[model samples]
Target: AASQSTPWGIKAIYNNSNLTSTSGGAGINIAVLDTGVNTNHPDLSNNVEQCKDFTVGTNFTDNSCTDRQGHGTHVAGSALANGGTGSGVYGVAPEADLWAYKVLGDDGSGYADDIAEAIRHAGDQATALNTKVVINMSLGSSGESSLITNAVDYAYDKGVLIIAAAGNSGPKPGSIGYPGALVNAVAVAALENTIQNGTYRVADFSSRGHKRTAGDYVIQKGDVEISAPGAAVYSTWFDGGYATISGTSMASPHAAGLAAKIWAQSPAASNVDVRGELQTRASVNDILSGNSAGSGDDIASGFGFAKVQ
Candidate 1:
C-alpha cells in the first residue's frame, strides 16, 4: 500500500541499494524494535530468518513478541515484506531478511528501559555481522529516559543505525517524544497522503520541532536525525490482510526501508558512513525550513518529505 502519487513517492526507495530489478538483497537483516512483528505472516515469513526476544526466549515468538496490537507488524511490513511471495502490501525490500525485538507490550506500549534493552541487543547481537539494516523504533514518550538514552548511545557505538519515530505531537502543544530526541538517535517525521486513492499529503498526526540535543533551531544539535513517510501507508498485516495506517510510527518504517536500500548498495559501508549517507541524501536537510505543511518544522513534514531516491 505504499503510495507513489506524491513527490515523495516510493520513488525515493530506489535511492536505496536493495531494491533490485525484482529480488533486491538476497540475505540482509533488519531488526524491528517496536510493538512486535508478525513473523509468520506470508509477506514476512520467507525473509524472516531469525530473532531473539528479551521478553520471551531465543525463538523471537511465543510468550513474547506476539504483535497483539498489529503496530509492529505494520511497520515490519513496510520495511520488508518478502515481496512477490504474497498478496497485499510489499515491503521496501522483500528479499531482505528481518528480525523482531518486542519491547512494546500487547496494549501498544512498553517501558523505556525495555526499549533500551532491545536496542542494545539489536546493536550487539542479532546476526553474524553483529548488526542489522536499521533498528526501527516507532514509539516515544514526552520526556527523556536514562534507560532509553543509554541504550541509544550503546547502539550507536556498536555500529548500528537507529531509525525512530519523530513523535505524534501535531497541531497541538508539547507533543514531541523521546529516545528519538536523544541527539544521537536518528529521529524521523511522518508524511501522509492517500496511498490507495487520495493525493499524497502530510498526515495530521506527525510530530516535530522538539528540543533536539542542542538549542539549535533545526534539531541540528541533538537527536532528530531525519524523517520519512508517516502518513497513511498500506502494508501487509498479521491477519493476511492490508490496511492504511498513520503516525510517525508509519513514517519510521519508510526510513528503515530506505536504510535497507542503502545497505543493499553499500554492504561494506560502516554504520557511521551509512548514517551519513542517509542524512546527506535525505530530502529534508534544513530541519528548519522547506519541509512540512502547516507550521513547517513545527507543524508536520520535516526537512523535506521522506525520500530515498
Candidate 2:
C-alpha cells in the first residue's frame, strides 16, 4: 500500500543518519502552526490527530482547517506525510501524528497575537494529551514582538519544542527573524539540494544570523540552530495534488520532523533534552560556502545541517 520512497530531503538526513528504515516517530505529535491543511489529502489524512482554526473564531471549534494556499499542506507533508495507499511521498516522520493549527489566514497572513495564542493553545494541548509535542512554525517576520516571545517562552516552559523559519531575507548578516530568533525556539536555515565540495550548500535566501565571535560556540538568541533542505522541495499539496516549493519556511519542517523522530525514539526525553540532542547530533559537514567554513557554529548554517546520529 504505502510506498517506501521518500523525497531527497528525507533521504539526505534520514538516509545519511541510517534512519531510512526506522519508523521512529510513532507516538510523537507535531503541531503545524500555519495556514491549515487539506484534511482529505491521501498521504496526510490518516495521521490527522487534531485540527483547529485559530484564525477565524475565538475558540478552537471553528473547524475550518482546510488549506487553500497549499503552503501548510506542503509543510505538513514534509513533516509527516505517510505516502498513502498506492502512490505518494513520505515525510521525515511518517508515523507521527499531526495537529493542524490554522494560525494564519488563507492568504498566508495573520496577526502576531493570534500566532501567540495558537502557541499557547499548542502547549496546552500537549499537556492535555500527555505527549511530547513538537511545534513547527514555518513562518516569521523581520520585526520582533514580545507577544510572540512570551508565547514561545510559555510553550518551551511547558516542555514543547518550537522549530521556526529563520526568514528568507538574505545571505546578509543579522537577518534572522522572530519568533525564530527567540532564545527558546530553534531557528532553521535553508539549504539548496546541490552539493559542493562534498556537502549541501546554503540557499542564498536563507537568512543569516549574527556572527559568533571567535572561539564562541554557545547557542544564542538570533542565531540559527541548524540547516536543512529547503530549495525546490517536493511534497503533498492542497486538493490532493503535490508540488515543490522553497524557503526557510520549508526548512523548518524538516528539522521539526527529525525532532519528532528523535523524541519518539526516547519518549522519556524532555524537550530540553531533545533540543540539546539535535544540536549535539548536527554536523557541519554541509557548509554554507560564502559564510561558514564548515568548522564550528556560524551565522549561515548554525551548527550545520541537522543529521540524526
Candidate 3:
C-alpha cells in the first residue's frame, strides 16, 4: 500500500498537480540509467520489475543487476520506494514499475559507448514490455557526444520521455551539462528547501544554462526545464537500508517520477504534452526567476520549479 504521506519532494510537487489521482504510476514504466539497484531493499523490492547490466569489463563482468554503489538504489528510491518498515521513505510514484538499466560500473563510471547502449537498450525494453517508458538519467558529462545525443533522440522519437540531471556545476553562467543540454532532453536542476517563508532556493551546485554548442554550430541553450528538491534527500540505500543524498541526480528523479504519475493518469497524452504540462502547471516563482531573476526561462531554473498543480 502507498504511504499516507509521501516524501517531502513528492508533497512539494505532487498533490496540486493534475496527476494526483494517478495510481502512483501503477502501469507506467520508468527506466533508471545509472549504477544499479539493490533488489533486496524492503522499500524497493516489489517495484523492481526488471533489471539489466550494460557495464562490462576485463577485471570483472558487470553483468549482475545488484547495486554495489549506492547511487542507483538511492535514485530508485526517490522514484518508486514503496515503504515497508525502513524509514517509511516512499518515492514520488511508489507503484511505478522500475527497469534498472546498469550503465555505470561499481566505480560509478562507464564508457560513453555503454551509456549510449543503455539508452538504446531501454528503447528495446520498452517495446518488449509493451509499456510507455520514461528514462531517467541522473548522470552527465561536460563533453558532448553525438552518440548519446543521437540515442536520446532515437528514444524520444519512439515515445520515451528522457529526463536528465543538469549536472552539479553551478553558481556559474553556463554549467548545465550534456545529455541534459541536448535539446530533446528535459533537463532538471536542483533546489533546496529554504528555512524561511515556505520557499525553496536553487541549490548552489545546481547547473545553470545559457548558450552552448552542439556539434560545430552554436545553439541558444537553456537546458533546465524544471527544478526539484536535491539537497539532503533521503531514500533507499544499497544495503537494505536508507540514506540521505543530494544533487541534480536527486532532482532529476523527482521530475521523472512525477512524469510517470502523469503518464499513468493520462494514457493518451504524448511525450511532448506531458513535458508541456509540467511547465504549464508550475508556479510562476518556480521559473529560474534566478541567475537572471524575472528573466523568464533564465539559466537558473529553466521553466521554473517543477510543481504539481
TM-score of each: 0.79, 0.93, 0.87
Q: In candidate 2, what residue range of length 10 has the lowest lDDT sum? A: 15-24
TM-score of 2: 0.93
lDDT by residue for model 2 (51-149), tens: 888878675555568788888899999999887874777888989999998888757487888889889998998888888999999998999888889
Better of 1 and 2 by TM-score: 2
Model 2 CA deviation exceeding 4 Å by range: 1-4, 16-22, 212-215, 284-293
Against the unseen true structure, what C-alpha lDDT does each candidate score? 0.63, 0.83, 0.76
- Give one digit per residue, the lDDT tens place, for model 3 in 168-235: 98968688888898888888888776532334677778888874422121123455677887887877
Best-fitting candidate, measured by lDDT?
2
How do the candidates rank by lDDT, highest first? 2, 3, 1
Better of 1 and 3 by lDDT: 3
Best of the candidates, TM-score = 2
lDDT at position 241, candidate 3 = 72
Cα lDDT for residue 132, candidate 3: 85
